[PDB]
Amino acid sequence: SDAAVIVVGAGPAGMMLAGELRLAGVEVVVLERLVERTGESRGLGFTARTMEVFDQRGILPRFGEVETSTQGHFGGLQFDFGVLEGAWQAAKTVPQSVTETHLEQWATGLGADIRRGHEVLSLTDDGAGVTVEVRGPEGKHTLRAAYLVGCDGGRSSVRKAAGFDFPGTAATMEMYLADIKGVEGITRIIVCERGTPPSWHEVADAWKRLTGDDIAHAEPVWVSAFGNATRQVTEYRRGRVILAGDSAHIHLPAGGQGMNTSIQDAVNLGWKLGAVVNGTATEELLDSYHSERHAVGKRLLMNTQAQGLLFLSGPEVQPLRDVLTELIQYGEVARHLAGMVSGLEITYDVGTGSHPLLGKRMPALELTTATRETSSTELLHTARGVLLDLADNPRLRARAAAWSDRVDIVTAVPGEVSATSGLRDTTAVLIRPDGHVAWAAPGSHHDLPMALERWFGAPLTG
Amino acid sequence: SDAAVIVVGAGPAGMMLAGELRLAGVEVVVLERLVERTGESRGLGFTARTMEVFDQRGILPRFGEVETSTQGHFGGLQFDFGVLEGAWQAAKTVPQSVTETHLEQWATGLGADIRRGHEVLSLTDDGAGVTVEVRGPEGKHTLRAAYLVGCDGGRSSVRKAAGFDFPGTAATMEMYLADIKGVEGITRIIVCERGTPPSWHEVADAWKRLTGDDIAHAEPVWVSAFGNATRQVTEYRRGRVILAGDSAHIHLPAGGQGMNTSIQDAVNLGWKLGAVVNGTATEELLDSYHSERHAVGKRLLMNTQAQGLLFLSGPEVQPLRDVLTELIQYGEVARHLAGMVSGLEITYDVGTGSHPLLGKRMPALELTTATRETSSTELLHTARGVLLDLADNPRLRARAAAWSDRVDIVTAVPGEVSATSGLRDTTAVLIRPDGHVAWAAPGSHHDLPMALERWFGAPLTG
Numbered sequence: 001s002d003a004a005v006i007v008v009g010a011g012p013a014g015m016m017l018a019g020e021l022r023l024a025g026v027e028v029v030v031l032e033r034l035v036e037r038t039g040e041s042r043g044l045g046f047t048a049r050t051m052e053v054f055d056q057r058g059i060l061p062r063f064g065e066v067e068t069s070t071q072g073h074f075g076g077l078q079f080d081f082g083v084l085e086g087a088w089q090a091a092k093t094v095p096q097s098v099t100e101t102h103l104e105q106w107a108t109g110l111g112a113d114i115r116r117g118h119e120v121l122s123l124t125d126d127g128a129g130v131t132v133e134v135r136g137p138e139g140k141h142t143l144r145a146a147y148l149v150g151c152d153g154g155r156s157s158v159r160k161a162a163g164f165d166f167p168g169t170a171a172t173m174e175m176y177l178a179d180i181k182g183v184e185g186i187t188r189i190i191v192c193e194r195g196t197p198p199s200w201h202e203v204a205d206a207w208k209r210l211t212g213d214d215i216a217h218a219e220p221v222w223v224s225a226f227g228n229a230t231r232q233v234t235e236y237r238r239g240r241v242i243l244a245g246d247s248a249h250i251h252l253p254a255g256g257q258g259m260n261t262s263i264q265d266a267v268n269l270g271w272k273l274g275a276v277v278n279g280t281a282t283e284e285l286l287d288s289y290h291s292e293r294h295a296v297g298k299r300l301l302m303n304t305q306a307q308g309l310l311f312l313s314g315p316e317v318q319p320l321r322d323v324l325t326e327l328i329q330y331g332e333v334a335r336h337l338a339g340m341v342s343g344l345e346i347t348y349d350v351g352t353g354s355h356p357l358l359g360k361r362m363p364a365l366e367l368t369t370a371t372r373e374t375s376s377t378e379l380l381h382t383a384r385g386v387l388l389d390l391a392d393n394p395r396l397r398a399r400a401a402a403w404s405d406r407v408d409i410v411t412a413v414p415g416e417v418s419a420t421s422g423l424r425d426t427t428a429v430l431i432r433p434d435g436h437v438a439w440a441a442p443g444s445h446h447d448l449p450m451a452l453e454r455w456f457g458a459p460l461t462g
Numbered sequence: 463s464d465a466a467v468i469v470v471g472a473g474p475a476g477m478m479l480a481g482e483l484r485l486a487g488v489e490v491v492v493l494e495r496l497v498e499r500t501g502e503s504r505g506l507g508f509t510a511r512t513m514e515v516f517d518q519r520g521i522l523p524r525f526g527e528v529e530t531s532t533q534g535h536f537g538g539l540q541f542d543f544g545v546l547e548g549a550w551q552a553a554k555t556v557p558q559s560v561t562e563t564h565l566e567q568w569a570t571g572l573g574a575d576i577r578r579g580h581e582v583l584s585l586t587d588d589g590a591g592v593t594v595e596v597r598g599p600e601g602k603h604t605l606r607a608a609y610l611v612g613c614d615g616g617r618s619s620v621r622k623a624a625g626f627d628f629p630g631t632a633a634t635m636e637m638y639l640a641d642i643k644g645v646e647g648i649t650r651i652i653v654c655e656r657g658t659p660p661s662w663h664e665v666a667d668a669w670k671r672l673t674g675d676d677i678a679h680a681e682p683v684w685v686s687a688f689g690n691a692t693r694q695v696t697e698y699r700r701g702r703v704i705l706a707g708d709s710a711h712i713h714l715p716a717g718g719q720g721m722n723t724s725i726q727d728a729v730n731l732g733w734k735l736g737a738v739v740n741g742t743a744t745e746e747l748l749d750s751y752h753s754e755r756h757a758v759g760k761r762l763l764m765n766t767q768a769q770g771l772l773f774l775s776g777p778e779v780q781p782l783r784d785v786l787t788e789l790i791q792y793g794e795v796a797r798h799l800a801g802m803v804s805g806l807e808i809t810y811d812v813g814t815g816s817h818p819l820l821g822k823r824m825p826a827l828e829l830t831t832a833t834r835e836t837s838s839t840e841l842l843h844t845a846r847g848v849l850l851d852l853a854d855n856p857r858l859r860a861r862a863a864a865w866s867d868r869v870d871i872v873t874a875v876p877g878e879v880s881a882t883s884g885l886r887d888t889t890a891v892l893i894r895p896d897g898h899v900a901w902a903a904p905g906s907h908h909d910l911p912m913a914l915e916r917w918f919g920a921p922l923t924g
């Protein structure tokens with residue numbers, strides 16, 4: 001009947017979060033209404049940043065060999081992401097349900113208590129905790145935790161119940177998709193017909209009219225409908241209730257962004273909520289999940305709507321495609337768009353300074369220490385802070401030592417770095433558990449103890 | 463009853479063309495149905511390239527002091543054109559009718575025979591000439607010329623009569639504009655209301671609903687309606703019949719492009735048609751007006767429709783504005799868009815080579831010769847070819863001399879040039895009468911006699 005945190009939903013947000021919470025030592029119970037995984041695999045593949053956030057927790061061997069691609073697009077306009085370092089890491093084909101499967105197995109292995117066939121019906125936040133009414137296999141009962149995170153999808157029960165505001169615009173049309181056998185081991189169709197208002201046969205009629213080709217004879221594996229409703233909560237947290245994934249942001253599924261943003265909500269949240277449970281941090285840390293991820297979510301609605309207009313509008317939008325195509329020929333444009341599609345652009349407010357990596361993801365950096373060959377990616381496996389002492393400076397090691405219960409201080413000779421990476425001439429980096437750079441030397445206005453304090457809390461009492 | 467060329471229309475296309483034809487020594491008769499200039503001034507200002515094509519004919523003193531601005535925009539998104547060299551030359555406020563007035567006076571001074579209150583009713587092209595039925599002050603009569611150029615506006619009588627194909631898309635909505643006194647020497651309004659189907663009072667109703675402010679009490683100077691019909695002729699010439707201006711391309715009036723493109727159609731055409739009349743060139747030269755200017759016209763429909771979508775669509779297009787705004791922060795994007803709005807981007811196919819100016823406009827270049835201080839702009843005043851011998855190379859002077867009846871060969875020490883201008887390390891430039899670079903050394907694949915031949919025709923018989 002207890003846990004430190006209750007997570008509602010075992011989609012990719014919920015499973016990632018459960019795992020992250022376990023890495024922070026948190027007792028976590030996940031509540032999922034479905035008895036089994038649906039096996040749909042509506043999304044295909046994942047972004048280079050998602051691949052990186054899997055990698056930094058050692059999750060990748062679970063997938064085996066993964067096909068990658070630099071061939072991306074923005075609203076249908078094709079171009080090469082190769083122009084942006086690290087964009088090569090995008091997984092091309094993995095179905096959503098395989099990804100979910102691995103994250104479930106990962107999080108379960110770490111000790112997450114996942115209760116399937118348990119539906120959350122209602123909830124009460126009373127300042128000291130959250131209590132949920134749940135229907136399980138045994139019928140109605142209650143559970144209680146310090147915190148409750150709604151990872152329960154587009155039509156979130158938690159969002160509805162805790163009184164979150166969810167402004168934005170209602171659905172305007174309807175698309176269709178189908179898993180089908182016959183003509184071209186089943187191939188997918190993408191049915192986006194002109195002017196469909198908000199049986200599988202109608203899905204055929206929508207294909208014969210759009211392309212001229214007849215397919216009313218195909219075996220229907222999966223058939224589904226979806227909108228272009230675009231909404232985001234004004235608050236990611238109301239007291240002891242938190243949201244991550246679709247529960248916080250819905251949009252047209254354009255340019256492969258939803259699962260990726262939701263998994264990455266969970267990666268921002270886990271370590272922060274864990275610090276809070278463990279008592280090493282205050283709710284100030286917790287607020288940075290709202291500000292950081294509301295900002296990201298806002299950008300996701302922009303991204304997907306902008307692509308949707310380019311994809312779904314008639315020939316009237318062609319002059320815009322044409323202009324944008326011309327712009328895409330410029331390196332800076334290509335990279336900007338690749339930055340946005342990949343998620344590699346993501347930059348949190350961590351204070352000012354000239355260091356080009358502040359607030360951005362720490363890119364993969366090879367490291368030789370005194371006792372081992374390792375990498376920044378490797379050192380992130382346990383979801384602790386990582387301070388890289390790149391120029392054998394022992395003063396640095398002593399300034400940070402009061403946070404060494406929470407931050408690994410690593411002295412290493414760094415590998416070769418690219419001009420564009422941001423790592424040239426860098427003598428030190430403080431990396432947050434989610435991989436984001438809190439501070440670097442030289443070129444941070446804020447000092448190292450401020451950064452350590454801001455993300456990890458009070459120093460140890462000597 | 464005769465002339466070498468008959469021009470139909472004394473809008474800015476017709477007046478510029480008349481002038482250009484006079485500079486080539488051509489007997490030109492302009493036929494204009496209106497008795498006086500309407501005085502509307504629907505367009506305000508003109509582009510930096512228009513300013514340059516006026517400048518290169520010494521037309522500018524007619525305007526006196528002209529206010530210029532680097533503050534431009536693309537579909538409402540404001541930014542600084544200063545990033546592109548020469549974009550500063552955009553005239554900010556001059557009304558269309560002042561500009562027309564000066565071009566009329568300029569062309570009349572050069573000997574253009576302009577017949578006002580003469581309307582073209584019909585025409586016949588019979589392989590050796592064109593004959594028009596015209597109603598004048600004396601009633602119906604006929605005129606004949608070697609060529610006929612329709613510069614007769616959006617609803618072109620010439621285009622209709624000579625059987626030009628005019629594909630594209632019909633008008634979709636309707637806007638309004640008004641010259642008005644009262645609140646804020648009369649100020650203009652811009653009325654673009656949501657969902658108006660294809661009296662001045664309705665123009666007031668369209669202002670009170672759009673802004674919330676009431677103005678049903680204002681004195682109506684000028685009041686007009688216009689569409690977003692977007693069409694372009696597939697042929698700029700059918701035999702001995704030619705089109706320039708709106709007669710060839712109609713579009714939404716977005717981002718100040720129409721008059722500018724039409725004046726510039728006339729600048730491309732005049733010298734070519736003149737060479738043809740004078741017998742120094744063949745109809746091959748004349749075809750390059752079609753190819754060069756159809757291409758430009760096609761780009762104009764793209765430009766204006768793309769801006770219109772950004773201007774006139776609801777909030778649904780805001781994510782696109784936002785993305786585009788972000789892109790505009792990049793120099794290359796800013797310049798590209800400035801290139802397109804200013805017209806400075808315009809580049810004709812003149813053959814290949816590495817020289818960065820091939821086919822582009824020759825930028826203003828100061829020149830010291832043996833007998834005078836001058837400029838490339840100055841040398842273009844008489845609409846002849848100009849070959850700049852920038853490194854005292856007498857072999858060059860002799861290779862071109864067989865075209866010196868048609869091409870001024872000028873030996874000069876060039877002034878300081880910018881890195882981005884395209885003139886660094888350039889030893890020679892062949893400039894066409896419209897200001898476009900046909901050939902330059904080093905870095906042209908084609909040789910100088912080929913270029914001379916292609917634009918000026920047969921060499922002189924020694």
Ligand SMILES: Cc1cc2nc3c(=O)[nH]c(=O)nc-3n(C[C@H](O)[C@H](O)[C@H](O)COP(=O)(O)OP(=O)(O)OC[C@H]3O[C@@H](n4cnc5c(N)ncnc54)[C@H](O)[C@@H]3O)c2cc1C
Pocket residue numbers: 008009010011012013014031032033034042043044045096118119120121151152153154156157177226244245246247253255256257258259260261262
């Ligand atoms: C056609 C289509 C294509 C897509 N393609 C892509 C793509 O290419 N790339 C991409 O990144 N994203 C894509 N998405 C979005 C993606 O599918 C993600 O699942 C979604 O964006 C985020 O998942 P989530 O974990 O937050 O929520 P969900 O995946 O919706 O999971 C929420 C879970 O909560 C459970 N639940 C709900 N209510 C309760 C309750 N009261 N009690 C207990 N449990 C509950 C549900 O059963 C569900 O399993 C696509 C979506 C669609 C429709």
Ligand SMILES: Cc1cc2nc3c(=O)[nH]c(=O)nc-3n(C[C@H](O)[C@H](O)[C@H](O)COP(=O)(O)OP(=O)(O)OC[C@H]3O[C@@H](n4cnc5c(N)ncnc54)[C@H](O)[C@@H]3O)c2cc1C
Pocket residue numbers: 470471472473474475476493494495496504505506507558580581582583613614615616618619639688706707708709715717718719720721722723724
């Ligand atoms: C509201 C508005 C704002 C605009 N703003 C701008 C702007 O900011 N910048 C810009 O560059 N452009 C702008 N334009 C376009 C611009 O007004 C130009 O005049 C047009 O783009 C090109 O002019 P033209 O000489 O080809 O034809 P026109 O100006 O239409 O002149 C054609 C002439 O032919 C005459 N004619 C027609 N039929 C016959 C016949 N049978 N016989 C004899 N004569 C005939 C007509 O009387 C007319 O004078 C705007 C247009 C509108 C409506």
Ligand SMILES: [Cl-]
Pocket residue numbers: 252253254255256257258259
């Ligand atoms: Cl998506």
Ligand SMILES: [Cl-]
Pocket residue numbers: 371372373374
């Ligand atoms: Cl090792």
Ligand SMILES: [Cl-]
Pocket residue numbers: 714715716717718719720721
């Ligand atoms: Cl225009």
Ligand SMILES: [Cl-]
Pocket residue numbers: 833834835836
């Ligand atoms: Cl002089």
